[PDB]
């Protein structure tokens, strides 16, 4: 019984396919296409009144959060690409996201060596 649906969650470490390759990233906001809300995590907050930024309930996509329709209905994950910066905080779904383990990464290794050697 592989509980992979738990490794891609709140602050979960996962791999995501940026183009043709897998990268390490930290999930900051989970996306549920059933409500069209997403579940973020409160940590880097400027304080807040009380529950304002302490209890992240499923919040609907704001006006500057429009997620690509190709991934909006496929459970997305607003991650922050590890190794880059906040300027690379992108939405990755089960379409590009994987589980950060010794198997998917094992591919990533070969992948960053093979998808990088491909000459055509």
From Swiss-Prot:
Residue ranges constituting the Tudor-knot domain according to the UniProt record: 13-98
Region of interest (Disordered), residue spans: 39-65
**Compartments it resides in:** Nucleus
Q: Which domain of life is it from?
A: Eukaryota
Compositionally biased region (Polar residues): 39-53
Q: Which family does it belong to?
A: Belongs to the MRG family.
* Protein name per UniProt: Chromatin modification-related protein EAF3
Which organism encodes this protein? Saccharomyces cerevisiae (strain ATCC 204508 / S288c) (Baker's yeast)
